[PDB]
Ligand binder design. Structure first.
Ligand SMILES: NC(=O)c1ccc[n+]([C@@H]2O[C@H](COP(=O)(O)O)[C@@H](O)[C@H]2O)c1
Ligand SMILES: [Mg+2]
Ligand SMILES: [Mg+2]
Length: 361
């Protein structure tokens, strides 16, 4: 799993994120050399680490993004503890370890004049021919900066592996037979967005059990099962920058506190914590209890009638996890906004920046 050929090229980047600018250059470099070593640099709290893409995560995403290439290897250049001399020691250590042959024609592709200048001073006498080539990376670096500043605006250019991280997430929460499913569908269809289904609905249909028949192990199953489903939408190739999620672990954790014995709830507690902590939410739409009884079709037999009891615990728990600043309650139909959906789609506009057409003048 090392790089073959004589003419090999070295390409640098912080890749925060990798985008079609880098890629278009990287593939050009691959057509001119027998092989290419991508070198990701980073240090704690760097520009990428401050948006949640530390060097390690960026390196793994790169390996995944180029898992397909016979002649492209991804390598890590750890710039912690730096003083150019030791930096170059590591860089040529990378080259030596990740190459197969001797008598190489190595071409560095560098974008800053300081780097090329300090690199030319330090070619070691190891049988290789070294050249440093300058590249105008202004447009690539500006693009990566624009992407971090507003990912939704430059979404199509973000490499798909990195899109996993930059997605806005809207989660709809509320007791059943309150309209969530109609709401999630219409919100997501408004902006050509993907959406998830309430997993408890699908679990209860596939396993043919009612709300009162759920035991602890069923809740356990619904936690990881709803998360997988939401994670599947977050990472969908249909995602354009915003996804909508029909409930999450908090919802399930509200039902579980309300209906499980204390001991059985105490036992799901670690899985609840781990799952809820892994949930990135940007906007939380809460549908409050109302005397409506929507019933899109399927009836949660028991998760009705005590809607206020559910809504109080739900708000209790949303506070417990410090999420209230992301929360918007759709308290309409007797409050203002025209409909529950008008309020919601406008909140989607406030929190994600997407344009929404008005119906009237
Ligand atoms: N289920 C959810 O609400 C939710 C929200 C955000 C991310 N995720 C998942 O967790 C991961 C987040 O990765 P980062 O650590 O890069 O943010 C993603 O791969 C995604 O699939 C899940
Ligand atoms: Mg991924
Ligand atoms: Mg508690």
């Amino acid at each position: 799993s090392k790089l073959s050929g004589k003419n090999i090229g070295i390409y640098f980047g912080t890749f925060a994120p990798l985008h079609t600018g880098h890629q278009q250059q990287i593939y050009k470099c691959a057509s001119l050399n027998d092989g290419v070593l991508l070198v990701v640099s980073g240090y704690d709290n760097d520009r990428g680490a401050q948006i949640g893409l530390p060097l390690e995560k960026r390196f793994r995403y790169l390996r995944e993004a180029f898992n397909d290439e016979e002649n492209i290897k991804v390598s890590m250049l750890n710039e912690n503890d730096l003083g150019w001399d030791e930096w170059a020691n590591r860089l040529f250590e990378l080259i030596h370890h990740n190459t197969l042959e001797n008598d190489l024609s190595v071409t560095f592709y560098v974008g800053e004049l300081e780097y090329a200048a300090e690199l030319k001073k330090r070619f070691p006498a190891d049988g290789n021919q070294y050249a440093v080539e300058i590249a105008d990376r202004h447009d690539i670096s500006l693009s990566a900066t624009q992407i971090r500043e507003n990912p939704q605006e430059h979404w199509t250019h973000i490499n798909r592996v990195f899109r996993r991280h930059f997605s806005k997430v809207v989660t709809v929460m509320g007791s059943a037979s309150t309209g969530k499913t109609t709401l999630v569908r219409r919100l997501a269809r408004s902006i050509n967005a993907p959406f998830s289904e309430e997993y408890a609905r699908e679990y209860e249909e596939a396993f043919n059990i009612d709300d009162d028949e759920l035991k602890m192990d069923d809740y356990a199953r619904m936690i990881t099962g709803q998360y997988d489903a939401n994670s599947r939408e977050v990472n969908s190739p249909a995602n354009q920058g915003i996804v909508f999620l029909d409930t999450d672990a908090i919802v399930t954790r509200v039902y579980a506190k309300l209906y499980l014995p204390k001991e059985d709830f105490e036992q799901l507690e670690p899985l609840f914590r781990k799952t809820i902590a892994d949930e990135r939410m940007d906007l939380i739409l809460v549908i409050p209890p109302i005397t409506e009884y929507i019933d899109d079709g399927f009836r949660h037999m028991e998760w009705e009638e005590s809607r206020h009891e559910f809504h109080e615990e739900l708000m209790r728990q949303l506070a417990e996890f410090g999420l209230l600043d992301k929360v918007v309650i759709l308290d309409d139909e007797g409050d203002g906004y025209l409909t529950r959906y008008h309020h919601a789609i406008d909140a989607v506009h406030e929190y994600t920046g997407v344009k929404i057409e008005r119906l009237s003048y």
